[PDB]
């Protein structure tokens, strides 16, 4: 259902089967790279990503060793990595912000099944955009995803309140409560969680 929706929760424990199937998944996980609460490698492997889609695309932000671990989860969860987006970070004058200085962030792109009716090839795999608060992904990614798969249902894992978007259901443990509008989701949520608590 078109307007923004979100669920404050521990993504480790929420029964994501109540949410239905999504054309696009995006995740910016708290990888345990060597600031916030982290998820162990095993917890990320165990996330029930496979129930979320049948045919569609996964967008998986990665840095450091999660460039490798993210590829492992991606394949474990049943996806093939078919693209990799980079966001070149600039200032407001369009200048770029271990062994090398890091001018970019990486977003892996995975496919599951055989998605039909997507507009593949409309955008290119480089995003140039101005940095904002630490830990924010650039808003351009939502436009690229909308053009790729307009009007379909989408879900974001480990998002924050600024990430809530129309057509998207946002999950994260710093969201303000639960805000669901889709009736099938509202229905399945009430069954699975009749007292509105999400534990164990």
């Amino acid at each position: 259902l078109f307007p923004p929706q979100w669920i404050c929760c521990d993504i480790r424990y929420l029964d994501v089967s109540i949410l239905g199937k999504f054309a696009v998944v995006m995740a910016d996980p708290p990888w345990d790279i060597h600031p916030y609460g982290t998820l162990t490698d095993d917890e990320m492997r165990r996330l029930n990503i496979p129930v979320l889609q049948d045919d569609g695309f996964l967008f998986l932000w990665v840095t450091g060793r999660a460039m490798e671990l993210g590829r492992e989860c991606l394949n474990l969860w049943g996806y093939e990595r078919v693209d990799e987006i980079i966001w070149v970070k600039t200032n407001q004058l369009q200048r770029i912000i271990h062994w090398l200085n890091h001018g970019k962030e990486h977003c892996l792109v995975g496919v599951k099944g055989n998605p039909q009716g997507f507009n593949q090839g409309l955008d290119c795999d480089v995003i140039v955009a101005e940095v904002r608060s630490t830990s924010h992904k650039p808003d351009e990614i939502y436009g690229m995803i909308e053009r790729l798969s307009p009007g379909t249902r989408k879900i974001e894992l480990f998002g924050r309140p600024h990430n809530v978007q129309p057509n998207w259901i946002t999950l994260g443990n710093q969201l303000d409560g639960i805000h669901l509008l889709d009736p099938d989701v509202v229905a399945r949520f009430k069954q699975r969680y009749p007292d509105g608590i999400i534990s164990k």
Partner: protein, 239 residues
């Protein structure tokens, strides 16, 4: 303003609009040029070539196999991953592997791990199309190539921005050599699948299309005999 939208509207890639791409650094460049070994090079069909013949073991390997995707002999990742790179890499050494933009970003990581390296950097060559504003699996137009840096054993940015070369031009940006040489990683530098056009002081180039050779294993090793065995390639020569 949204450069992704701008690209879908006009065809000008987002990277076309990046601008400007402590005092001097040139003295470092001068020290590098001073300690550079003479250029050495060898024509060799690397499929058939026993790579063991290449000695001594190298401090840096730059590996640039000719992938099929660079066109339209090509090397598959099947071919590349069967190269015995760990036989010629020094126990502490570095690899820079051009992986393209497709399955190479995954299979190249398998290769690095196969040969005993861990990836420490992902260097992205971003191609502008200022002058001229399609894999079945591709979701997006691919406008970049990745060069993976691996380490084994115990000033620059990780982006290279140049205009996309003309069709059929396979050369990679010479800037990758600057990044490598500025790391001061040692002086035994090997470039596998280089060409006449890539030969460069401080480097041993080995590839099938070279037209001439001057490689001599004993001459090559004499450039690193004592007292020159452990120089970083960034310091004064030893008097």
């Amino acid at each position: 303003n949204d450069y992704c939208q701008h690209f879908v509207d006009t065809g000008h890639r987002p990277q076309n609009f990046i601008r400007d791409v402590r005092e001097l650094i040139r003295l470092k460049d001068e020290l590098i040029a001073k300690s550079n070994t003479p250029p050495m090079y060898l024509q060799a069909d690397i499929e058939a070539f026993d790579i063991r013949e290449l000695t001594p073991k190298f401090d840096v390997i730059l590996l640039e196999p000719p992938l099929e995707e660079y066109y339209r002999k090509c090397w598959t990742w099947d071919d590349i991953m069967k190269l015995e790179i760990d036989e010629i890499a020094a126990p502490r050494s570095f690899i820079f592997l051009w992986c393209g933009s497709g399955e190479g970003l995954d299979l190249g990581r398998v290769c690095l791990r196969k040969w005993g390296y861990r990836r420490c950097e992902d260097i992205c060559w971003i191609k502008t199309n200022k002058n001229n504003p399609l894999d079945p699996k591709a979701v997006f137009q691919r406008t970049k190539e990745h060069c993976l840096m691996g380490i084994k054993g115990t000033v620059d940015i990780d982006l290279i921005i140049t205009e996309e070369p003309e069709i059929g031009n396979i050369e990679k940006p010479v800037e990758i050599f600057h990044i490598i040489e500025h790391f001061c990683l040692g002086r035994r530098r090997l470039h596998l699948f280089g060409r006449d056009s890539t030969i460069r002081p401080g480097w041993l180039t080995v590839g099938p299309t070279l037209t001439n050779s001057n490689y001599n294993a004993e001459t090559y090793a004499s450039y690193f005999s004592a007292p020159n065995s452990y120089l970083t390639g960034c310091t004064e020569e030893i008097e």
